[PDB]
Amino acid sequence: MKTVVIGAGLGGLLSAARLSKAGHEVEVFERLPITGGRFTNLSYKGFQLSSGAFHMLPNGPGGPLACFLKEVEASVNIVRSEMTTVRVPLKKGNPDYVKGFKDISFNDFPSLLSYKDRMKIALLIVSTRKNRPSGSSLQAWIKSQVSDEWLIKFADSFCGWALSLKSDEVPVEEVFEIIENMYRFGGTGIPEGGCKGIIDALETVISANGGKIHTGQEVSKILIENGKAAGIIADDRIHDADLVISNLGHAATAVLCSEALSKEADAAYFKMVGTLQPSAGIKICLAADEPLVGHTGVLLTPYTRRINGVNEVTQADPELAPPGKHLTMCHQYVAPENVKNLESEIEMGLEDLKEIFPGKRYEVLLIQSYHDEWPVNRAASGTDPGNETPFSGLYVVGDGAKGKGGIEVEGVALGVMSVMEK
């Protein structure tokens, strides 16, 4: 078939790589000067920062993304991270890190509970695998099981870092599917070259399979003929297609289909699009003169105003920073109501840094905020719709149409796989 992909984000490039290998003519149209969307590198003062993602795969070398890459014969080294750690107050009862802190391994989170509560968690670790909690938020479920506030702080940190959500905003069943994927695929990892390593590898496969990628080209319309995708208009030129893959998310895709959509015949689709809620966050990048995390995993920070966790990917790939420097990146969840208040949100994160990393030698390199049309995810984890649209031959991929239960790009990969199978 003749196929076109709108947008060179990770979803679009995964699609292009698989479709070209599958024997289809593929052209990708990307509006920006470079490919990769929110998953590529940004050269900044000698550092390889990113356009979004923290240079990390949620399931490292074992998950749906890593698997997709092997399936299309993309070549890129993904290293498995060391176990994630968690920063907690020195004494139970301390509300923050002011009086000092200690670090525990992620898997030892129950160690801070009473014996009674620890044993309850041990049994739930067994029972929940096949008897999955459902029908409430994670926070509500935890509270029904254990009263110790530690688990809520820990859950909020995990949910903030991994999903850019609060634990009272994610369905418990989604969290248990995510947990099942940890067992299936393993922990985090870091691609050599950062995000761009993966982007470059996919571009190589696309090129080797006769696909073409066009940057600096904005798609302005999806052509529909008799309820069927028929092509696109990009930079005022018509391109025919039997298949259109949109990497823009449903909302933006709907706008491109505006002339063909019916508020009557497509009422369910309009309603769906109107419910989509993106997630928001702020990333603080530090130019560190010494290690702050000290390993290749995540440091979760549950006892802060805003910061949920931090990583240090130069532990895995030193080429992402100048000699004698580390790149340490922090994430904080931003609630939709506070997007209008980004300045004060940032201030709070900056205060957190002093308590997380007291007396350490670093400078704030860049602060980047994400929300709305360039968000953390186009659809909040646990809420993704499918990849289909009212029109045959038109599919949506990307983090506005993630496979259920995949964290971040693992979800993006699952979604692309679903479309490909269809």
Ligand X SMILES: Cc1cc2nc3c(=O)[nH]c(=O)nc-3n(C[C@H](O)[C@H](O)[C@H](O)COP(=O)(O)OP(=O)(O)OC[C@H]3O[C@@H](n4cnc5c(N)ncnc54)[C@H](O)[C@@H]3O)c2cc1C
- Binding region for ligand X (CB under 6 A): 6-11, 29-32, 37-39, 52-54, 56-58, 218-219, 247-248, 281, 283, 370, 376-377, 398-399, 408-409, 412
Closest distance of CB 370 from ligand X, Å: 4
CA atoms within 13 A on the CB side of 408: 22
Q: Using CB atoms, what's the residue nearest to ligand X? A: 9
Please identify, using beta-carbon distances, which residue of 112 and 162 lies nearer to ligand X: 162
- Residues 247, 4: contact at Cβ < 8 Å? no
Bridge pairing between strands 25-29 and 212-214: parallel
Please identify, using beta-carbon distances, which residue of 152 and 379 lies nearer to ligand X: 379
What is the H or E stretch that residue 113 is in? none
Alpha-carbon distance of 410 to 90, in angstroms, equals 35
Alpha-carbon distance of 132 to 175, in angstroms, equals 10
Please identify, using beta-carbon distances, which residue of 248 and 307 lies nearer to ligand X: 248
Alpha-carbon distance of 410 to 77, in angstroms, equals 17
The count of other CB atoms within 10 Å of the CB of residue 337 is 7
Please identify, using beta-carbon distances, which residue of 7 and 187 lies nearer to ligand X: 7
Please identify, using beta-carbon distances, which residue of 7 and 405 lies nearer to ligand X: 7
Q: How far is CA 254 from CA 261, 299, 416, 421, in A?
A: 8, 39, 19, 23
Closest distance of CB 256 from ligand X, Å: 7
Using DSSP's 3-state secondary structure scheme, residue 180 falls into helix
Binding residues for FAD: 11, 30, 38, 54, 56, 219, 378, 399, 409
Please identify, using beta-carbon distances, which residue of 133 and 415 lies nearer to ligand X: 415
Closest distance of CB 266 from ligand X, Å: 21
The count of other CB atoms within 10 Å of the CB of residue 64 is 26
Closest distance of CB 80 from ligand X, Å: 15
Alpha helices (runs of H) in 164-308, residue ranges in sequence order = 172-185, 195-208, 250-256, 267-275
Alpha-carbon distance of 233 to 247, in angstroms, equals 15
Closest distance of CB 188 from ligand X, Å: 8
Extract the tokens encoding 81.
């991270």
Using DSSP's 3-state secondary structure scheme, residue 241 falls into coil
Closest distance of CB 8 from ligand X, Å: 5
Please identify, using beta-carbon distances, which residue of 218 and 242 lies nearer to ligand X: 218
Residue length, the chain? 422
Closest distance of CB 57 from ligand X, Å: 6
Binding residues: 11, 30, 38, 54, 56, 219, 378, 399, 409
Extract the tokens encoding 325.
């420097």
Closest distance of CB 164 from ligand X, Å: 7
Q: By C-alpha distance, which of 152, 38, 85, 51 is closest to 297?
A: 85
CA 29 to chain centre: 22
Bridge pairing between strands 212-214 and 298-300: unpaired
Q: By C-alpha distance, which of 289, 323, 282 is closest to 306?
A: 282
Closest distance of CB 7 from ligand X, Å: 2
Alpha-carbon distance of 151 to 141, in angstroms, equals 11
Please identify, using beta-carbon distances, which residue of 56 and 417 lies nearer to ligand X: 56
Please identify, using beta-carbon distances, which residue of 133 and 160 lies nearer to ligand X: 160
